[PDB]
Design an enzyme around this catalytic site. Structure first.
Site, PDB file in Angstrom:
ATOM      1  N   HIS A  69      -7.169  -4.995  -1.989  1.00  0.00           N
ATOM      2  CA  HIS A  69      -7.861  -4.928  -0.712  1.00  0.00           C
ATOM      3  C   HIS A  69      -8.134  -6.256  -0.003  1.00  0.00           C
ATOM      4  O   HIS A  69      -8.334  -6.274   1.206  1.00  0.00           O
ATOM      5  CB  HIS A  69      -9.132  -4.105  -0.881  1.00  0.00           C
ATOM      6  CG  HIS A  69      -8.854  -2.716  -1.354  1.00  0.00           C
ATOM      7  ND1 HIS A  69      -8.501  -2.406  -2.651  1.00  0.00           N
ATOM      8  CD2 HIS A  69      -8.701  -1.568  -0.647  1.00  0.00           C
ATOM      9  CE1 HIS A  69      -8.133  -1.112  -2.681  1.00  0.00           C
ATOM     10  NE2 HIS A  69      -8.235  -0.559  -1.487  1.00  0.00           N
ATOM     11  N   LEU A 107      -5.469  -3.045 -11.415  1.00  0.00           N
ATOM     12  CA  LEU A 107      -4.875  -4.311 -11.011  1.00  0.00           C
ATOM     13  C   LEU A 107      -4.316  -4.312  -9.588  1.00  0.00           C
ATOM     14  O   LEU A 107      -4.451  -5.300  -8.869  1.00  0.00           O
ATOM     15  CB  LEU A 107      -3.779  -4.695 -12.012  1.00  0.00           C
ATOM     16  CG  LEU A 107      -2.913  -5.918 -11.685  1.00  0.00           C
ATOM     17  CD1 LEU A 107      -2.565  -6.647 -12.964  1.00  0.00           C
ATOM     18  CD2 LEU A 107      -1.653  -5.494 -10.933  1.00  0.00           C
ATOM     19  N   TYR A 108      -3.711  -3.201  -9.174  1.00  0.00           N
ATOM     20  CA  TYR A 108      -3.115  -3.099  -7.841  1.00  0.00           C
ATOM     21  C   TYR A 108      -4.074  -2.832  -6.679  1.00  0.00           C
ATOM     22  O   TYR A 108      -3.641  -2.525  -5.570  1.00  0.00           O
ATOM     23  CB  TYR A 108      -2.011  -2.037  -7.839  1.00  0.00           C
ATOM     24  CG  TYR A 108      -0.647  -2.580  -7.479  1.00  0.00           C
ATOM     25  CD1 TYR A 108       0.452  -2.374  -8.319  1.00  0.00           C
ATOM     26  CD2 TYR A 108      -0.451  -3.307  -6.302  1.00  0.00           C
ATOM     27  CE1 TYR A 108       1.712  -2.879  -7.997  1.00  0.00           C
ATOM     28  CE2 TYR A 108       0.804  -3.815  -5.965  1.00  0.00           C
ATOM     29  CZ  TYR A 108       1.882  -3.598  -6.814  1.00  0.00           C
ATOM     30  OH  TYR A 108       3.132  -4.078  -6.479  1.00  0.00           O
ATOM     31  N   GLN A 125       0.834  -1.198   0.000  1.00  0.00           N
ATOM     32  CA  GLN A 125       0.000   0.000   0.000  1.00  0.00           C
ATOM     33  C   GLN A 125       0.875   1.257   0.000  1.00  0.00           C
ATOM     34  O   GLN A 125       0.722   2.136  -0.839  1.00  0.00           O
ATOM     35  CB  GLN A 125      -0.911   0.001   1.238  1.00  0.00           C
ATOM     36  CG  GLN A 125      -2.005   1.067   1.231  1.00  0.00           C
ATOM     37  CD  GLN A 125      -2.887   1.031   2.482  1.00  0.00           C
ATOM     38  OE1 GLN A 125      -3.930   1.686   2.544  1.00  0.00           O
ATOM     39  NE2 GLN A 125      -2.464   0.269   3.483  1.00  0.00           N
ATOM     40  N   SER A 140       5.049  -3.983 -13.336  1.00  0.00           N
ATOM     41  CA  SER A 140       5.958  -3.859 -12.202  1.00  0.00           C
ATOM     42  C   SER A 140       7.408  -3.681 -12.598  1.00  0.00           C
ATOM     43  O   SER A 140       8.017  -2.649 -12.288  1.00  0.00           O
ATOM     44  CB  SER A 140       5.852  -5.072 -11.271  1.00  0.00           C
ATOM     45  OG  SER A 140       4.563  -5.158 -10.687  1.00  0.00           O
ATOM     46  N   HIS A 160       1.269   3.800  -3.349  1.00  0.00           N
ATOM     47  CA  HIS A 160       0.677   5.121  -3.236  1.00  0.00           C
ATOM     48  C   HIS A 160       1.611   6.288  -3.530  1.00  0.00           C
ATOM     49  O   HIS A 160       1.242   7.458  -3.360  1.00  0.00           O
ATOM     50  CB  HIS A 160       0.019   5.256  -1.876  1.00  0.00           C
ATOM     51  CG  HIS A 160      -1.265   4.497  -1.788  1.00  0.00           C
ATOM     52  ND1 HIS A 160      -1.372   3.187  -2.203  1.00  0.00           N
ATOM     53  CD2 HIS A 160      -2.511   4.884  -1.430  1.00  0.00           C
ATOM     54  CE1 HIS A 160      -2.631   2.802  -2.112  1.00  0.00           C
ATOM     55  NE2 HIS A 160      -3.341   3.813  -1.646  1.00  0.00           N
ATOM     56  N   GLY A 197       0.620  -8.140 -14.366  1.00  0.00           N
ATOM     57  CA  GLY A 197       1.274  -7.259 -13.412  1.00  0.00           C
ATOM     58  C   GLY A 197       2.793  -7.276 -13.445  1.00  0.00           C
ATOM     59  O   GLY A 197       3.437  -6.268 -13.146  1.00  0.00           O
TER      60      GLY A 197
END
Ligand code: HEM
Ligand code: HEM
Ligand SMILES: CCCCCCCCO[C@@H]1O[C@H](CO)[C@@H](O)[C@H](O)[C@H]1O
Ligand SMILES: CCCCCCCCO[C@@H]1O[C@H](CO)[C@@H](O)[C@H](O)[C@H]1O
Ligand SMILES: CCCCCCCCO[C@@H]1O[C@H](CO)[C@@H](O)[C@H](O)[C@H]1O
Ligand SMILES: CC(=O)N[C@@H]1[C@@H](O)[C@H](O)[C@@H](CO)O[C@H]1O
Ligand SMILES: CC(=O)N[C@@H]1[C@@H](O)[C@H](O)[C@@H](CO)O[C@H]1O
Ligand SMILES: CC(=O)N[C@@H]1[C@@H](O)[C@H](O)[C@@H](CO)O[C@H]1O
Ligand SMILES: CC(=O)N[C@@H]1[C@@H](O)[C@H](O)[C@@H](CO)O[C@H]1O
Ligand SMILES: CC(=O)N[C@@H]1[C@@H](O)[C@H](O)[C@@H](CO)O[C@H]1O
Ligand SMILES: CC(=O)N[C@@H]1[C@@H](O)[C@H](O)[C@@H](CO)O[C@H]1O
Ligand SMILES: CC(=O)N[C@@H]1[C@@H](O)[C@H](O)[C@@H](CO)O[C@H]1O
Ligand SMILES: CC(=O)N[C@@H]1[C@@H](O)[C@H](O)[C@@H](CO)O[C@H]1O
Ligand SMILES: CCCOc1ccc(CC(=O)O)cc1Cl
Ligand SMILES: CCCOc1ccc(CC(=O)O)cc1Cl
Lengths: 551, 551
Positions: A356, A352-353, A171, A498, A175, A494
Site C-alpha cells: 500500500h 508480504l505483498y 495490484q 515470486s 489479485h 519475496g
C-alpha cells in the site's frame, strides 16, 4: 512449557512433540545433523562460509553496467538466470506443507486448495507469549503501531523511479492469486488456481467464466463506448461484482475479479487485457479457419498466461530488482533441473505483498488532481479519459517507496492495521524466525533493523525484544538498500515466492512449452516477445508513454 | 477429409490443423523431425536400434532365477527398479494433457479434476470411419463381439496362480481412483485425488469423511459384532451407500466408497483397512500423548497410504509381473531424477483395468459353494464368517486368466459390453495407435494379434482391418505371454499408468518422505515394512492362509 515454542529445530528441521514433554527435530535432508540440526555437513559448511551476503550480491548486481552489458550478451546470462531460478525456488516447499489447520503435513493440506499454505508452522497456541517465548504477554496495539510507524506524513517517492502504472499492474496481477474468502475466514482463498491462471480476467470459476464469454470466435463479451472497447456491463454479463448499494447495473462493469470496480487503475488493466484476448483470438482464427469457439478461447488464454509471465519476469521484476543483469523468461533454463511445476499460495506471501505505500497522496491525470474520494469508486473515469490517457498518466506519476516506514496514506492505513491483526489470528511466527527460514541471520536489535535510533528505541519499548517483532511490521520497517524501493528481507523472502509462482506453472513444463500449445509459431512468438508497451499499444488507438519507470 | 484422421504424426508429435485443409506436426522434443516426426536424430537412432523388444526383456526377467537371486541382494536391484520406474513413467504426460472435451492443451483441462485425462486424443468426429480412416463405416455390435470373444464357456484359471484375494484387492484398490460419474457422464470422475488417496476408505469428500470419523483418538467409527470390529451402520454414520431399495439403514455398512456394500469381498477389505487405521492410531497416541484427534487421524491416513503403495508394488505388482527381479518401493530411488509428483487418471487406464475375467463361476467358502445370486448383495456373509475365514477362502480360490479371450462369467459380461460402448462414446483411438504410443510396433494382422486362426478370421471379417481393432478388445484378445495372466500390451500400457500412479503421489516426494511426516520412526517403519500378511493378521484373531497366490 511446549518445547517447540523455542523453535529449537534449525535450518528447516521439523519440531515434533514426543511423550508428555520431549521433542525431536527431523533434520532429514537439511544438510545438518544433531539434536537441533546445527552440526553442518562438509559441503553445507563450505557453502555457508563461502556465500557472500545478500547486501554484497545486491551491490554486485547494481554496479558495473559496462561489465553486465558484456555478460548479458553471453551465455552467462543464461547461467546466472538459471541459478537465480533454482536457488531462489528451492526455498519453497513443493508439494506444499502446512495450512491454517495443520501445523504438519497431511492429505487434507495437500488436496484442499481452499487453504493458503504456510512456510513456517504457526506459533503453538500454548506458548508463554503470543510470539512464542520472547516479548510481552501482549502485543502492541495494531492501530497505534500503524499510526506511529506506517502512517504517511510527507509523501516519499520511490528512489528507483517506479510509477503508478507499475503500482496498478502489481495490484491487478496479485489479485488473481490473493483472494481471501470473507465467509471462510483468514487462511482461506477463493483463488483456487494458486497462481498465474488469469482468473482475474476469466473468473475463478466456470459458471462465472461462461457468463463472461461471448461464445463466438473464442472472444470475451464487451461493449462500445466512444468507439472504444470496454468490459461489458453486469446487465449483459450477470456476474457478481462488489459495488456500493445505490449504483445501477448499467454502470457496473463485469470483469472476473469482483473487486476491480473499486479503482480506475484496476479496471484499466481489466480493459487492456480483455482487448488483448480478443486480439489474440483474431490472430488464431486467421491461422486456424477450422477451430471452434472453445479451442480459440482456451488457446488465447494460454497465450495471455504466457505473455503475463514474460512481462512479469522481464519488466516488472526487472524494474523492482534494479539489477543490471538482464533477467530472462525461458522455461528451457529449467529442463535439465529437478523442479515441480505446481504452486500453492502462502499466507506469508499474501502478507508480504501488501504494498500500500505505493499509492500516492492523490491521482494526477493531466492538469487535474483527483482525491481518493474522487477516485475510489469512480465508475466513469476510465471511460471519460480512455486507456491511452490513463496509461500515460499512471506511467508519469511516481509511486511511493515501499520500505523505510511512515509512507502509507491515511486513506488506506486501515488495511495495514488489519494485516497486523490477521497475522496474530494466523499466529505468524516472529520476523527473525522468517529471516532464518530464508537464509539470513536474525536481527540482534531494533537499531540494527532500522538504520537509526529514534524509531528503534520506541519499537524496543513496545515490543520488548527484537525476537518478538512481527512479520509484516518487520518487512516495512527494515532499512532499505541504498536507493531502493525496500529492504533486503522483502527481496530475499519475496523473490522465492515470486519466481516459484512464475515458473511453477504447468505451461512452463517440457510437456506444455511447445508451439502447438499456443496454436503454432505465431502464438508462441506472442509469448516469447510479449512487452508492456505492446500489451498497451497494440490495443489502443494511439501509443502513449508506457512503462514501469517514471519518465 | 481431416488430415489428422490419418494419425500422420508419429512418436508423440502433435497433429495440428492449419488453414482450410493442411496439417503440421509439432515434433518438439520427440527425438525426430520431418513432416511426421519420422526422421530420427543420431541418438534417437542409437537408442531405438539397441533397445531389445518387450518380449525379450520379459524373457530376461522371467528366467535364470539363480542369476536374479544375487542381483536382488545388491545395489543392482535398486539400479534396475529406478530404471523401470523412470522409463515406464516417461510415457505418461505430466502435467496431464487432453480430456473428453479438449483434444488439445488448455487451462481448463489442467485445472479441472472432474475430468479423466487421456493419453491419445479422440478420433476426430469428422473422420470417414469411427476409428479414423480404416475399417467399416460401422463397428461390430458390442454385445455380439462380447458374446463371441469374451464370454466364458469353460473356466480358465490364471496360469500364474493368482487367487481371489488378489482379485478382490484389485477391485477394492482401483475403485478409489476409478469412480465414473453417472450424472456427469463418461469422461468424468468423482474420485478427485486421482490416485492412491484412500478415498474408498475415508471418502471422496470432507463431509462424508466427517460422518465416518469418530472424532476421538483420530479413529474411524465402528460397531462390534460377535466380538469383532466391523464398519459402523449407516444409522450411526449417515452416509449415502448404494444398497437395494428396502434394506433399512440399520442393516447397511458405511465405508467410504458408496458402491462397496455390493460385495462381501469388497466389504472384507473395507473391514481390514478400517481395523488397520484404528490400530495405527493406537500406536500413534502411545508415541504422542499430546496430539489431538485431527493429527492422529491425518497422520494415520498418511501411514496407510504408504502401506498401500508398499504392498501394491512389492506384492501386488510382483504377483502380476511374475518377474524374478524383486520390485522395490523406495521413493528415494527417484530423488536424483526429474519426476513430477502428481498424477491424473486416464480414461484409457480405466478401460484397461476392467479385469472382470478374474471372477469365478462361483464362490467357494469352506465346504460351501456360493453362486452370484447368493453372493452379490449378501448383507450377512462377511459377519457370518468373519475376516479370517473369508481371507482364507479367497486366498485359496484361483482367479480366472485375464487375457486370451472367452473368460468372462456370463453374470457380469454386461460390464464388458458397456465398456466397449463407452469406448465409442469416448471415441478412443484404435488399438494399433495405442500400441505405438506405448512403444510397440502395430499388429499387421489379426492372426498376429491372436496367436491363432479361428478367432482371428472372424475378427477380420467383422472389423475388416487390423487398424480398426478397438482398445479394450485388443487388450483382452491379444495372445498371452507363455504362462502369463495376460498379453504384453496389458503390461507395456498398464505399467506406465500404474507406476506413475504409485510414485506420482506427494508422499513419495523429497518434501514428504520424512519420518516426521508419519509421526516418527515408528510410523515410518509401518510403511517401509508393510505387508499383506501383516495387514490381515495384525487385525484378526487368528492368522489364516493370506496371499495373492493360491497355495
Ligand atoms: C487505491 C489504493 C488501494 C486501496 C483502497 C486498497 C484497499 C484494500 C482493501 C480494502 C483490502 C482488504 C482490506 C481488509 O479486508 O481489511 C486490500 C487488500 C490487499 N491489497 Fe490493497 N488497496 C490498494 C492498493 C494496493 C496495492 C497497490 C497493492 C500492491 C500489490 C495492494 C495489495 C493488496 C493485497 C495483497 C491485499 C490482500 C489480498 C487478499 O487477501 O484478498 N493493494 N486492499
Ligand atoms: C462379482 C464381481 C464384479 C461385479 C459384479 C462387477 C460389477 C461392475 C459393474 C456393475 C460396473 C459398472 C458397470 C456399468 O456401468 O455398466 C463395474 C465397473 C468396473 N469394474 Fe467391476 N465388477 C466385478 C469385479 C471387478 C474386478 C475383479 C475388477 C478388477 C480390478 C473390476 C474392475 C472394474 C472397473 C475398473 C470398473 C469401471 C470403474 C468406473 O469407471 O467407475 N470389477 N464393475
Ligand atoms: C574447518 C572449518 C571449521 C569451521 C567451524 C564451524 C563450527 C560450527 O560449529 C557449530 O556451531 C553451531 C552454532 O554455534 C552449534 O550449534 C553446533 O553445535 C556447532 O557444532
Ligand atoms: C553476482 C552473481 C549473482 C548471482 C545471483 C544469485 C542468485 C541469488 O541467490 C540468493 O542469494 C542470497 C544471498 O546469499 C541468498 O540469501 C538466497 O537464499 C539465494 O537464493
Ligand atoms: C534386465 C533389465 C531389465 C530392465 C528393466 C527395463 C524396464 C522396462 O522398460 C520397458 O521396456 C519395454 C521394451 O523395450 C518398452 O517398450 C517400455 O516402454 C519400457 O518402459
Ligand atoms: C545441543 C543443543 O543445541 N541443545 C539445545 C538445548 O540446550 C536447549 O535448551 C534446547 C531448546 O532451545 O535446544 C537444544
Ligand atoms: C471454514 C469452513 O468453511 N468450515 C467448514 C464448516 O463450517 C462445515 O460445517 C464443515 C463440514 O463440511 O467443513 C468445514
Ligand atoms: C469445478 C469445475 O469448474 N468443474 C467443471 C464442472 O463444473 C463442469 O460441469 C464440467 C463440464 O465442463 O467441467 C468441470
Ligand atoms: C467529470 C469529473 O471530474 N469526474 C467525476 C469526479 O469529479 C467525481 O468526484 C467522481 C465521483 O463522484 O466521479 C467522476
Ligand atoms: C514424408 C512423409 O512421410 N509423408 C507422409 C505422406 O506421404 C502420407 O500420405 C501422410 C499420411 O500418413 O503422412 C505423411
Ligand atoms: C456434464 C456437466 O456437468 N456439464 C455442466 C453443464 O450442464 C452446466 O450447464 C455448465 C455450467 O456450470 O457446467 C458443465
Ligand atoms: C473441497 C473441500 O473439501 N474443501 C474444504 C471445505 O469444504 C472445508 O469447509 C474447509 C475447512 O475444513 O476445508 C476445505
Ligand atoms: C445362512 C446362509 O446360508 N447364507 C445366505 C445365502 O444362502 C443367501 O443366498 C444370501 C443372500 O440371500 O445371504 C446369505
Ligand atoms: C514480491 C516481489 C518480488 O521481488 C523480486 C523477485 C525477484 C528478484 C530477483 C532475485 O534476486 O532473485 C528480485 C525481487 Cl526485488
Ligand atoms: C496392468 C497392471 C500393471 O501391471 C504391471 C505393472 C508393472 C510391471 C512391471 C514393469 O514395469 O515391467 C508389470 C506389470 Cl504386469
Amino acid at each position: 512449557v511446549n518445547p517447540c515454542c523455542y523453535y529449537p529445530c534449525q535450518h528447516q528441521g521439523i519440531c515434533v512433540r514426543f511423550g508428555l514433554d520431549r521433542y525431536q527435530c527431523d533434520c532429514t535432508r537439511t544438510g545438518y545433523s544433531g539434536p537441533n540440526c546445527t552440526i553442518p555437513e562438509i559441503w553445507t559448511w563450505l557453502r555457508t562460509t563461502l556465500r557472500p551476503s545478500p547486501s554484497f550480491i545486491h551491490f554486485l548486481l547494481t554496479h558495473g553496467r559496462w561489465l553486465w552489458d558484456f555478460v548479458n550478451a553471453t551465455f552467462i546470462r543464461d547461467t546466472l538466470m538459471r541459478l537465480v531460478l533454482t536457488v531462489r525456488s528451492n526455498l519453497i516447499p513443493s508439494p506444499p506443507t502446512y495450512n491454517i489447520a495443520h501445523d504438519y503435513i497431511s492429505w487434507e493440506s495437500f488436496s484442499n486448495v481452499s487453504y493458503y499454505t504456510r512456510i513456517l508452522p504457526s506459533v503453538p497456541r500454548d506458548c508463554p507469549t503470543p510470539m512464542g517465548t520472547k516479548g510481552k504477554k501482549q502485543l502492541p496495539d495494531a492501530e497505534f503501531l500503524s499510526r506511529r510507524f506506517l502512517l504517511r506524513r510527507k509523501f516519499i517517492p520511490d528512489p528507483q523511479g517506479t510509477n503508478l502504472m507499475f503500482a496498478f499492474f502489481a495490484q491487478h496481477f496479485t489479485h488473481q492469486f490473493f483472494k481471501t474468502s470473507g465467509k471462510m475466514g483468514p487462511g482461506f482463498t477463493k483463488a483456487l488456481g494458486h497462481g498465474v491462471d488469469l482468473g482475474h480476467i476469466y473468473g475463478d470459476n466456470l459458471e462465472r467464466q461462461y457468463q463472461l464469454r461471448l461464445f463466438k470466435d473464442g472472444k470475451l463479451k464487451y461493449q462500445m463506448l466512444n468507439g472504444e472497447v470496454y468490459p461489458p456491463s453486469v446487465e449483459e454479463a450477470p456476474v457478481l461484482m462488489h459495488y456500493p448499494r445505490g449504483i445501477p447495473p448499467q454502470s457496473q462493469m463485469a470483469v472476473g475479479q469482483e473487486v476491480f470496480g473499486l479503482l480506475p487503475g484496476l479496471m484499466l488493466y481489466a480493459t487492456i487485457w480483455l482487448r488483448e484476448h480478443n486480439r489474440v483470438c483474431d490472430l488464431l482464427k486467421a491461422e486456424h479457419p477450422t477451430w471452434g469457439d472453445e479451442q480459440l478461447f482456451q488457446t488465447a488464454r494460454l497465450i495471455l498466461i504466457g505473455e503475463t509471465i514474460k512481462i512479469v519476469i522481464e519488466e516488472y521484476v526487472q524494474q523492482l530488482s534494479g539489477y543490471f543483469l538482464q533477467l530472462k523468461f525461458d522455461p528451457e533454463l529449467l529442463f535439465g533441473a529437478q523442479f515441480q511445476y505446481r504452486n500453492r499460495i502462502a499466507m506469508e506471501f499474501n502478507q508480504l505483498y501488501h504494498w500500500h505505500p505505493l499509492m500516492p497522496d492523490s491521482f494526477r491525470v493531466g492538469p487535474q488532481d483527483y482525491s481518493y474520494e474522487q477516485f475510489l469508486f469512480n465508475t466513469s473515469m476510465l471511460v471519460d479519459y480512455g486507456v491511452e490517457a490513463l496509461v500515460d498518466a499512471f506511467s508519469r506519476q511516481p509511486a511511493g517507496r515501499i520500505g523505510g516506514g511512515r509512507n502509507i496514506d491515511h486513506h488506506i492505513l486501515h488495511v495495514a492495521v488489519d494485516v497486523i491483526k490477521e497475522s496474530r489470528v494466523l499466529r505468524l511466527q516472529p520476523f527473525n524466525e522468517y529471516r532464518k527460514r530464508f537464509g539470513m541471520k536474525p536481527y540482534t536489535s531494533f537499531q540494527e533493523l532500522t538504520g537509526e535510533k529514534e524509531m528503534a528505541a520506541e519499537l524496543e519499548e513496545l515490543y520488548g525484544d527484537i525476537d518478538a517483532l512481527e512479520f509484516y511490521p518487520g518487512l516495512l520497517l527494515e532499512k532499505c538498500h541504498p536507493n531502493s524501493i525496500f529492504g533486503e528481507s522483502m527481496i530475499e523472502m519475496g523473490a522465492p515466492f515470486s519466481l516459484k509462482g512464475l515458473l511453477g506453472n504447468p505451461i512452463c513444463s517440457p510437456e506444455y512449452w511447445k508451439a502447438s500449445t499456443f496454436g503454432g509459431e505465431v502464438g508462441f512468438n506472442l509469448v516469447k516477445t510479449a512487452t508492456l508497451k505492446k500489451l498497451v499499444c497494440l490495443n489502443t488507438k494511439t501509443c502513449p508513454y508506457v512503462s514501469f519507470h517514471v519518465p
